Design a binder for this molecule. Structure first.
Ligand SMILES: *[C@@H]1O[C@H](CO)[C@@H](O)[C@H](O)[C@H]1NC(C)=O
Ligand SMILES: *[C@@H]1O[C@H](CO)[C@@H](O)[C@H](O)[C@H]1NC(C)=O
Length: 43
């Protein structure tokens, strides 16, 4: 994994954050869930 994530422990969401995440929603933990596809950037 990159220098942003760590594992699938799923820290945030369980009080670790203001229930708020970032890199996790980037399909790094497997918690995010959408109807379409997402996971894109305006690079
Ligand atoms: C969550 O963020 C709020 C500010 O938006 C802050 O006041 C609060 O202490 C934070 N809580 C945690 C667990 O990070
Ligand atoms: C596009 O931006 C990404 C970072 O979001 C960067 O890693 C990549 O090198 C950039 N590619 C080009 C062609 O600018």
């Amino acid at each position: 994994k990159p220098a942003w994530c760590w594992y699938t422990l799923a820290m945030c969401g369980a009080g670790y954050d203001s229930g708020t995440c970032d890199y996790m929603y980037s399909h790094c933990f497997g918690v995010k869930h959408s109807s379409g596809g997402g996971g894109s950037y305006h690079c």
